[PDB]
Amino acid sequence: VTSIKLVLLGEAAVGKSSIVLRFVSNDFAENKEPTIGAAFLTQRVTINEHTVKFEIWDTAGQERFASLAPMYYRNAQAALVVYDVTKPQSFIKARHWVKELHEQASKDIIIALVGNKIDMLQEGGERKVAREEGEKLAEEKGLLFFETSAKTGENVNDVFLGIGEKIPLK
Ligand SMILES: Nc1nc2c(ncn2[C@@H]2O[C@H](COP(=O)(O)OP(=O)(O)NP(=O)(O)O)[C@@H](O)[C@H]2O)c(=O)[nH]1
Ligand SMILES: Nc1nc2c(ncn2[C@@H]2O[C@H](COP(=O)(O)OP(=O)(O)O)[C@@H](O)[C@H]2O)c(=O)[nH]1
Ligand SMILES: [Mg+2]
Ligand code: NI
């Protein structure tokens, strides 16, 4: 068993808590309420005979909680920087989160850039962050890159496995 300290960061309402609920409980709530400060969750994944245990701090993305974020990313081994593919503002905030982690988090943190809510693009939804622009930011800044839907589950497990496949196991 190998534990991995992970933090989620990103603008309010991009779906951080929904990504974690999908990963931990395989559930989705259209009425998920804003997180208060942060929430802790765990989930285990199997890689061959290894158990990889994620210790997850799901931070609140509202500015009223912004000064709590450093305590949760301070000793994180992995971060998910989440934006909403239908909200270009949230991608500007993702860019700022990547620079803050490069300045202030551990020098050996692994970062995944995650564009969420892609299910919305198959209904009444506008893609306002091209996948290629997410990929470009990830390539330039040395991040993993995924697009996800917490609502359908699409690629959510792939995000967490992609991180666990890059950290040495016990
Ligand atoms: N269609 C769709 N809705 C989603 C998706 N992920 C989250 N949502 C919805 O978006 C809203 C905000 O989700 P939530 O997980 O609370 O986001 P958050 O980033 O944790 N907000 P906070 O930072 O304030 O805690 C909710 O209504 C939720 O159901 C997704 O992939 N698709
Ligand atoms: N990322 C990662 N993959 C691992 C690790 N240990 C095993 N694996 C995966 O498990 C596959 C098979 O593992 P191996 O130890 O060769 O076990 P075997 O195939 O059962 O005899 C490896 O090829 C990897 O894909 C590990 O520490 N990290
Ligand atoms: Mg939340
Ligand atoms: Ni092994």
Please tell me what resolution, in angstroms, this structure has.
1.5
- Indicate the helix (H) or strand (E) that contains 81: strand 78-84
Token match 């969420």: residue? Answer: 116
In angstroms, rounded to a whole number, what is the distance separating the alpha carbons of residues 28 and 21? 7
Task: Tell me the sheet residues that pair with 52.
Answer: 2, 45
3-state secondary structure at position 71 = helix
Kindly state the tokens that stand for 40: 């802790």
DSSP 8-state code for residue 165: T
3-state secondary structure at position 77 = coil
Alpha helices in the chain (DSSP H): 16-25, 69-73, 88-104, 131-141, 156-164
Q: Is 86 annotated as a binding residue?
A: no
> Residue 153 is part of which domain span?
1-170
Of the residues 1, 4, 48, which should be mutated to test ligand 2's pocket, given the most ligand atoms within 8 Å of the CB?
48
In the chain, how many domains are there? 1
Contact 112, 23 (CB under 8 A): no
The contacts of residue 103 (CB under 8 Å, 6+ apart) are none
CA 133 to chain centre: 17
Whole-angstrom Cα Rg for the chain: 15
CA atoms within 13 A on the CB side of 74: 6
CATH assignment of the domain containing 114: 3.40.50.300
Enumerate residues lining ligand 1, CB below 6 A: 12-18, 29-30, 32, 34-35, 60-62, 116-117, 119-120, 149-151
**What phi and psi values does residue 43 have, to the nearest 5 degrees?**
-155, 145
Task: Tell me the sheet residues that pair with 83.
Answer: 115
Number of other residues whose CB lies within 10 A of the CB of residue 108? 7
Measured in Å, how far apart are the chain's first and last C-alpha atoms? 7
Which atom belonging to ligand 2 lies closest to the Cα atom of 50? 6
